[PDB]
Homo-oligomer: A and B are copies of this chain.
Amino acid sequence: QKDLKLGELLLQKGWISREALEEALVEQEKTGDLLGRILVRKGLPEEALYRALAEQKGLEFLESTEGIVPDPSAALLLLRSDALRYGAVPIGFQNGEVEVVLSDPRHKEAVAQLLNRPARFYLALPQAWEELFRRAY
């Protein structure tokens, strides 16, 4: 449950409206869905989403999946539909950590999925992750 507030930094950066923050936040807190993830589509542009998320969480922004190729084994720590809900895909293993290609770091319902490993967190536009979710499982 930690970042420099999902939604809030996006608001501070001029990426979202407060109202978008709150709609997206309510579903995050209420349904377990996600504020960053929901904010895009509710008024937030995507690179802008990711730019704040990168600063909110400490994420390394990524490219499409012709670059970001999933891990034959780690990818199954979060399946396509879990990855979609989560806003993430698990890739790799180094010094105990799995990389997480986020769309949104707060997954209230089950951020624990994927994080069956210690992890490093990454970030990018949903086009990339959408294909990656399908590639993952």
Contact = CB atoms under 8 A, between A and B. Distances in A.
Interface of A: 1-5, 69, 71-77, 92-95, 106, 108
How many protomers of this protein does the assembly include? 5
A14 B95 CA distance: 31
A78 to B, nearest CB: 10
16 contacts: A1-B74, A1-B76, A1-B77, A1-B93, A1-B94, A2-B71, A2-B72, A2-B73, A2-B92, A2-B93, A3-B72, A4-B69, A4-B72, A5-B72, A72-B106, A76-B106
Given A1-B94, A76-B106, 11 more contacts: A1-B73, A1-B74, A1-B75, A1-B76, A1-B93, A2-B71, A2-B92, A2-B94, A3-B72, A5-B72, A72-B106
A90 to B, nearest CB: 11
Contacts of A76: 1, 106, 108
A92 B72 CA distance: 28
A1 B95 contact: yes
